[PDB]
Design a protein around this ligand. Structure first.
Ligand code: CL
Ligand code: CL
Ligand code: CL
Ligand code: CL
Ligand code: CL
Ligand code: CL
Ligand code: CL
Ligand code: CL
Ligand code: CL
Ligand code: CL
Ligand code: CL
Ligand code: CL
Lengths: 163, 163, 163, 163
């Protein structure tokens, strides 16, 4: 069964033990940054406070899903407080909303808000035109496999790229 | 006279004509991203809507200061909605608040929120300990001149690094 | 089947035609305020913009549910940006979260944030103690049938008061 | 010297000792709600945490101004996250911004957002038309002395109603 958790599990991974992300920072779950502190103990302290348990740096899938939903809520709130993103989000169906949230997980609300032409196209239901435009971007060149899946989601409005 | 506008003018520059930032994106003023679209016309369209004027891609200092204050307000609001940043911000004086906002301009609220040990030190008024810790960071290594000025601001609570 | 839509339908009503709320303001759906303007035309204009349709002041249940979900998202975001509400919300299960959101629909985030002792009790899983305290409140005296249902939801963690 | 602190001091009062507001709730400073709990001890506990001092329920003017600025920042952030208020606020000068913030202190962001016709008039710089419309409102009838001062501020763009 496909949904936003399974989508972001594919795109960001689901890691139950603390690990270093691509910038060297302690992370867990679905891309959840614990701390920029170089101390593994600091990361474990942040994790234990968040989870309410002495984790030893290892969480369960259900705990990861709790952190993930916290992060989804934060993404949605950033979207709703952003004048470029809110009207697009308001106009989108659940699957395309998941694609927009996916972009926020990757680059943050301000980063997604920068796609001014493509966002306008999405609001206007010009799915393929938006997709063709997004595929020309620096975002796409940097992470083309993920971007292609997210763009297919905008084009089709289905989970087909994740099946 | 030193203040947050003059501080960020030194750290991010004050550019009255549209230019490409370090990621190649059209920007103006004090680090204000206009669009990620590769179209200069798109950037000019965003700018003209924001300013209320047909700018030709060139703004006045006062217009730049208006955009800057919009960006400061956005930074402060992100700080106030972040559980790691809000209590620190609430506890800081104006000058150290400017240093925290400066970090948000550079890396965003979620990025600054990652400095969990240093933030705790700031909340506890352990200025030098926070400064020594921040100077060990990847942030510092990447942009050491700016980081050193911001860290001096946290250590001293003065504008001395910008004089 | 019980859920937050059905809960708030019982507590705030589901009205498909524009009506005046208890303060005389044009409202529709599940307590969704359209405008404080005394003009029915103004209310219809706001509604038509929100729905994307020439409604004549009458919406479908599905349209009402869309507006309702917009309002739920706004409530959750206000909760997450409030230092008194966020840690309680983070700690609660889905059913008790619905009770907290219900209070936000009624009185707003700042209003719910005022229940400082009861909120602490909820965070500590002291359900009955929180419920006994809330039943002593001015909120309860003003709207005792709704408050009793919401308080039962906090006490029991079930939808029993709505069945 | 007139400014937003002095404006709201006139409209909401400046009270250095805990008092009950018009709804019976413990309040201090410039309309700052401490708690809805009927316990004066609870109110004193909230106050002491906010101030960092054992206050005995009495604060200094400077402490009141700190709480006031926290409340101004919260109002501005609510304005900036509201699709009806943000574009108006972005377009207004400092004095008229103070009038909008004043309304948020009184009735909250969602309450001010309800003035859909008057807000449009303000965005269009139709000051007198907005003022004439606001004076017809339930808000005005309920609190006519305050509303008249705030409306004069919108009409004139000066502090004249507070001199
Ligand atoms: Cl759609
Ligand atoms: Cl774009
Ligand atoms: Cl990739
Ligand atoms: Cl300080
Ligand atoms: Cl740190
Ligand atoms: Cl540098
Ligand atoms: Cl629970
Ligand atoms: Cl309480
Ligand atoms: Cl009732
Ligand atoms: Cl103006
Ligand atoms: Cl109005
Ligand atoms: Cl009055």
């Amino acid at each position: 069964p496909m949904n936003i958790f399974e989508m972001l599990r594919i795109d960001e991974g689901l890691r139950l033990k603390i690990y270093k992300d691509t910038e060297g920072y302690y992370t867990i779950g679905i891309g959840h940054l614990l701390t920029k502190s170089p101390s593994l103990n600091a990361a474990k302290s942040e994790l234990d406070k968040a989870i309410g348990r002495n984790t030893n740096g290892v969480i369960t899938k259900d705990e990861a899903e709790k952190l993930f939903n916290q992060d989804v809520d934060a993404a949605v709130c950033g979207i709703l407080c952003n004048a470029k993103l809110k009207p697009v989000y308001d106009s989108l169906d659940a699957v395309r909303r998941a694609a927009l949230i996916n972009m926020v997980f990757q680059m943050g609300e301000t980063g997604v808000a920068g796609f001014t032409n493509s966002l306008r196209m999405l609001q206007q239901k010009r799915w393929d035109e938006a997709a063709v435009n997004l595929a020309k971007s620096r975002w796409y060149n940097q992470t083309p496999n993920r971007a292609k899946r997210v763009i297919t989601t905008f084009r089709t409005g289905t989970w087909d790229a994740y099946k």
